[PDB]
Every structure is written in structure tokens, then in C-alpha cells.
Amino acid sequence: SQRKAQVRGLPRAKKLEKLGVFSACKANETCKCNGWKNPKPPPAANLSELCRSCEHPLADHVSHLENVSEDEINRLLGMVVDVENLFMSVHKEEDTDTKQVYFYLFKLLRKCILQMTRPVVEGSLGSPPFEKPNIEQGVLNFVQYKFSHLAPRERQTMFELSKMFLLCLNYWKLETPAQFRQRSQSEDVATYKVNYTRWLCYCHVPQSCDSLPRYETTHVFGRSLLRSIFTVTRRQLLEKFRVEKDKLVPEKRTLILTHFPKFLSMLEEEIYGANSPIWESGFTMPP
Ligand SMILES: [Zn+2]
Ligand SMILES: [Zn+2]
């Protein structure tokens, strides 16, 4: 997000050079080049410099940008930075499933710069939302269902803990399907791999690469994903508390220690219990 700020502050000539790298040549009706390649060994390139690949000037790769607005140039530059970022991540990524998603998104964004379009993810994985009621609604229903009768102070503390839990879920990294496979039944794995891919494309990667449409984990998923992940999230949360507790202000420290474990235990019952009412779209409280 800081390399983004820096490139968006450059003179327009330099911005066009950066974009020319990812832009189609229109020197003539037959040139099929998809990007200007600087002929110099690796201050703005002159528009007359000839592409290494196709020998047509930079001008002919960026002429479509001559009259576009400043904000549209900056949107495109954002995609360039995300393309650079995804490219690094693809090469660095050990996990197959993750690497393939990063590579799909890399190609998607590169193609959008080439076509001056807006990215949208597409494939057999479907599009959001994935399940209703979603996690955010389930958790709201849970707080009403179990805690409505508490005194207003204790009730506020549960609400605050619910908001913290939802914020955690929205930034927490899911297990890879390979990790999930090591603790689960083999037939559960294919369904988790679809949800993990959805999660990466719609939720997690867009947090780092904001040219992609961004959806909250807790808004597009529901009980099924929550059943897959919750026991690990819970373990990770309680462990993180053990590590960080003493950096919290004492009021928060005490409240987490004495109310959060039970909140999580009680939510676990509603997540996995066949008989829970909080996952019905019709959920309401008595008058
Ligand atoms: Zn050309
Ligand atoms: Zn070219």
C-alpha cells in the first residue's frame, strides 16, 4: 500500500511507462504484442523508445491512455502493484493449492490491465454469498439467544467479545487444505478446498490486493465453513491470549480471561449442535 502511494505520486509520463509494460501494441492492425519491453539494460522512458519484442515505440502501447482520467490511471497502477505482489507470492509459495490461486489472480489482473477492465473472479467455485444466514448473523443471533437476560453491563461485555471474535475471523488465516486433511476425514477435504479457494479469492487476497472486490469472511460464509474451522480458531485464539494477555489494559485482561473461554464454549455448542435455532433465517426473540 506504500509502493502504491509512491507510484500514484509519479509524473504522468512515468506512470505511462509503468503501464506500457502491461499494455497492447496498436502500432498497426497485425502486431500482437501485449507489453512494451524496455530495450535498455535494467526517469521516464521516452515515448519513442522501441519495444524489444515488437520494435514499435512505447507511444503505440500507451496511446489508449493519452486521454484517460487521473483516477483511472491510478486504478490501473494499483493493479500493476498487485500484479507485482502476486508474482512474488506465486514464486515464494510452497503450498500447491495456495500457489495455484495466487497464479490465477496474477493472470486475472494482468489481463484486466491489458483490457482496461475491472477484475471479477470467475469459475466453478461460484460467487458470494456462499451461505445464509452468514456468520455475522449467526453470532448476533447467538448473543441475543444466550445473553439477553444478563444485566446490561454483562450484556455489553458479551457484545464486545462477539465483535472481537468476528474481527478475528475476518483477518485470521485459514488452514491450507493439506493442513485440514491431516486432522480430518478424507471425504470432508474436497468441500473444504472449495471454501479455502473462495476464501482466498474473495476475502483474504483482496485485503492485500485491493484492486480485487473485497468481501468479509463473516458476511459471505455461514455455519458450514464455521464448522470446518472453529475448533482451530478457538485453540489459536486462546493460545494468542496466553501470549499477549499482559499487554492488554487490566479491565480487558480480566474480562477476556473470565468471560471469553465460556463465550467460545457456548458458541461451540450452537455451531455443532443439531438442535440450535440461531442458524435459521426466521430467528427472532419473543416480544
Ligand atoms: Zn507492436
Ligand atoms: Zn511491443
From Swiss-Prot:
Compartment annotation: Nucleus; Chromosome; Cytoplasm, Cytoskeleton, Microtubule organizing center, Centrosome
Free-text tissue specificity from the UniProt record: In brain, highly expressed in the hippocampal CA1 region (at protein level). Also expressed in the hippocampal subregions CA3 and the dentate gyrus as well as in the cortex and prefrontal cortex. Expressed at low level in the cerebellum.
Main localization (coarse): nucleus
Summary of the knockout phenotype: Lethality during embryogenesis: embryos develop normally to 7.5 days post coitum (dpc), but growth is severely retarded by 8.5 dpc and embryos fail to form dorsal mesoderm lineages, including chordamesoderm and paraxial mesoderm. Differentiation of extra-embryonic and cardiac mesoderm is not affected. Loss of the dorsal mesoderm lineages is due to an increased apoptosis. Conditional knockout mice lacking Kat2a in the excitatory neurons of the adult forebrain display impaired hippocampus-dependent memory consolidation as well as impaired synaptic and nuclear plasticity.
Biased composition (Basic residues): 1-12
Keyword field contains Acyltransferase: yes
Residues recorded as bearing Phosphoserine in the entry: 211
Keywords per UniProt: Acetylation, Acyltransferase, Bromodomain, Chromosome, Cytoplasm, Cytoskeleton, Isopeptide bond, Nucleus, Phosphoprotein, Transcription, Transcription regulation, Transferase, Ubl conjugation
Cellular component aspect of the GO annotation: ATAC complex; centrosome; histone acetyltransferase complex; mitotic spindle; nucleoplasm; nucleus; oxoglutarate dehydrogenase complex; SAGA complex
Alphabetical GO biological process terms: cellular response to nerve growth factor stimulus; cellular response to tumor necrosis factor; fibroblast proliferation; gluconeogenesis; heart development; in utero embryonic development; intracellular distribution of mitochondria; limb development
An MF annotation (GO) of this entry: chromatin binding
Domain notes: Loop3 is required for substrate specificity and adopts different structural conformations in succinyl-CoA-bound and acetyl-CoA-bound forms.
Family: Belongs to the acetyltransferase family. GCN5 subfamily.
Subunit structure, as described in the record: Interacts with EP300, CREBBP and ADA2. Component of the TFTC-HAT complex, at least composed of TAF5L, TAF6L, TAF3, TADA3L, SUPT3H/SPT3, TAF2/TAFII150, TAF4/TAFII135, TAF5/TAFII100, KAT2A/GCN5L2, TAF10 and TRRAP. Component of the STAGA transcription coactivator-HAT complex, at least composed of SUPT3H, KAT2A, SUPT7L, TAF5L, TAF6L, TADA3L, TAD1L, TAF10, TAF12, TRRAP and TAF9. The STAGA core complex is associated with a subcomplex required for histone deubiquitination composed of ATXN7L3, ENY2 and USP22.
Protein's job: Protein lysine acyltransferase that can act as a acetyltransferase, glutaryltransferase, succinyltransferase or malonyltransferase, depending on the context. Acts as a histone lysine succinyltransferase: catalyzes succinylation of histone H3 on 'Lys-79' (H3K79succ), with a maximum frequency around the transcription start sites of genes. Succinylation of histones gives a specific tag for epigenetic transcription activation. Association with the 2-oxoglutarate dehydrogenase complex, which provides succinyl-CoA, is required for histone succinylation.
Protein name as catalogued: Histone acetyltransferase KAT2A
Species assigned in the record: Mus musculus
Coverage span on the entire protein: 83 to 378 of 830
